[PDB]
Amino acid sequence: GSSGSSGVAPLGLSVPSDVELPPTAKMHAIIERTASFVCRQGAQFEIMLKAKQARNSQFDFLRFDHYLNPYYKFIQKAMKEGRYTVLAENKSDEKKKSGVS
């Protein structure tokens, strides 16, 4: 009834009791989304972002003095290690979506 838990978490991914969850779906999405890009584009990506987006807040998880440090670092390390996946980015063997013209 009263009290409980707060924050949003993934499904397949099993986060331990050492990492903290995101504030809302928004931040959660930004993290994962950014991780996939930083993992696909390369480590250098994180630099360009942390550099250019120095005033941005959505990229606060990059700050070593942030609570999302472990969360982001985890999702990223996992996505690159071959544990975390984002949508169907490999195969499907079925009709795929289309782009607006």
Side-chain angles (χ1 to χ4, degrees), residues 53-72:
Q53 315 294 8
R55 228 171 260 281
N56 227 90
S57 219
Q58 311 239 281
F59 296 78
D60 279 344
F61 57 81
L62 299 165
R63 247 195 154 290
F64 60 82
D65 220 46
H66 213 254
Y67 69 96
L68 289 181
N69 224 231
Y71 201 57
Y72 173 58

Side-chain angles (χ1 to χ4, degrees), residues 22 35-36 49 58 63 69 72 77 80 95:
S36 228
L49 310 146
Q58 311 239 281
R63 247 195 154 290
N69 224 231
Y72 173 58
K77 189 175 268 149
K80 72 175 228 222
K95 218 247 203 299

Side-chain angles (χ1 to χ4, degrees), residues 2 77 84:
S2 228
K77 189 175 268 149
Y84 192 109

Side-chain angles (χ1 to χ4, degrees), residues 7-72:
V8 58
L11 288 124
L13 211 297
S14 6
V15 181
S17 199
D18 227 82
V19 188
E20 205 67 56
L21 279 179
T24 186
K26 185 89 242 276
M27 196 87 210
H28 181 40
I30 301 160
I31 300 151
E32 178 233 60
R33 187 173 242 191
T34 300
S36 228
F37 282 124
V38 179
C39 279
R40 278 218 224 71
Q41 306 283 121
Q44 215 220 34
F45 218 63
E46 181 147 10
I47 302 164
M48 290 189 304
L49 310 146
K50 289 183 74 187
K52 208 167 185 180
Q53 315 294 8
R55 228 171 260 281
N56 227 90
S57 219
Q58 311 239 281
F59 296 78
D60 279 344
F61 57 81
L62 299 165
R63 247 195 154 290
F64 60 82
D65 220 46
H66 213 254
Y67 69 96
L68 289 181
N69 224 231
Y71 201 57
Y72 173 58

